[PDB]
Amino acid sequence: PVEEYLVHALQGSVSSGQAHSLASLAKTWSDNEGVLLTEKLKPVDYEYREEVHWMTHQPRVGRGSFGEVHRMKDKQTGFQCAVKKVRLEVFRVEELVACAGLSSPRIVPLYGAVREGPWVNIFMELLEGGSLGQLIKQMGCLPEDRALYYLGQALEGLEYLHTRRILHGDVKADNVLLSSDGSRAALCDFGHALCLQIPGTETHMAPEVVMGKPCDAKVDIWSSCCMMLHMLNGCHPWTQYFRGPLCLKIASEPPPIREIPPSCAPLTAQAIQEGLRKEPVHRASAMELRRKVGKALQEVGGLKSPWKGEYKEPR
């Protein structure tokens, strides 16, 4: 109830504050208010309004599944970052509560969040390498060493989250952002996150999700391995082989391990198989798989292939 009391001073205002304060306010989001977490983004006279205090790039172009992620610039500081626009009516408290206060090089830094009208604007570091999703499309598919390298980094992000009892909930290439030189990958977008003790991408769904079973951190591991397949093949699993209601096929069919490219090294194939066990209790954890994937990268000679480089044909 004292938490409830402190939230009142925050309501109706945009302030520069700390992560815990943003999390507490976000709990009330189920007309301009919020907390900005970096001095690079500054409120003006209790406000932070779109096209007034911050502006989106040029004519508005987006990234993300819904074209909801934009480049933006603080008009006062000149600082450039990314904004994810979320509809207030659909906003999930966990999108901010699960990630406010996190600190890991494997998770994209949260810069703040501001409600304005029917919008929750979530601000974060702009990673100028773009998304791993964009990279797969741009390059066709990724060589084995680079795919293992990014899976490894995603799994390190997952270790950090799972230890803290946070389920990401939608691990996929679109949700992995890259530094300008491609050397650093970080998890982003906690829209589907859950605090342990709402559907992610269907192709990446674990059998226990589709079957309505109780879910734990292992769901992120299955999804990360569907992302691995996406990286190697240039397409999602279940894209070929099945052409109807997809959720049923995930439940009834063997894991999509037949999509592992034959040319992959044995430990790569082994790692993907352990992450794609249908029963969660049999599936590798984030730590186990991260060690296996790190070893697999070493087994193919470490990271050698070019950042960008040459278009490789999708399967």
- The experimental resolution of this structure, in angstroms, equals 2.2
Q: Which of 31, 45, 74, 170 is catalytic?
A: 170
Q: How far is CA 82 from the centre of its chain?
A: 14
The annotation status of 84 as a binding-site residue, yes or no, is yes
Q: State the DSSP H helix or E strand holding residue 177, giving kind and residue range, or none if neither.
A: strand 176-178
Q: Hey, how many other C-beta atoms are within 10 angstroms of the C-beta on 231?
A: 24
Q: Which of 104, 84, 80, 79 is nearest to 96 (CA)?
A: 84
The annotation status of 69 as a binding-site residue, yes or no, is yes
For the chain, give every domain's residue range.
Answer: 1-126, 127-315
190 in Cβ contact with 96 (< 8 Å) = yes
276 in Cβ contact with 268 (< 8 Å) = no
Experimental technique of record: X-ray
Query: Under DSSP, is residue 246 helix (H, G, I), strand (E, B) or coil?
Result: helix
Determine the CATH number of domain 1-126.
3.30.200.20
Proportion of the chain in helix, strand, coil states, percent, rounded to 5: 40, 15, 45
For domain 127-315, the question of CATH label 1.10.510.10 is answered with yes
Whether the domain at 1-126 and the domain at 127-315 fall into the same CATH topology:
no
Catalytic annotation on 170? yes
DSSP 86: E
257 in Cβ contact with 276 (< 8 Å) = yes
CA–CA gap between residue 105 and residue 36 (Å, rounded): 20
Query: Residue 313 — left, alpha, or beta (φ > 0 → left; ψ -120 to 50 → alpha)?
Result: beta
The annotation status of 92 as a binding-site residue, yes or no, is no
The annotation status of 64 as a binding-site residue, yes or no, is yes
14 in Cβ contact with 89 (< 8 Å) = no
The annotation status of 68 as a binding-site residue, yes or no, is yes
146 in Cβ contact with 274 (< 8 Å) = no
303 in Cβ contact with 271 (< 8 Å) = no
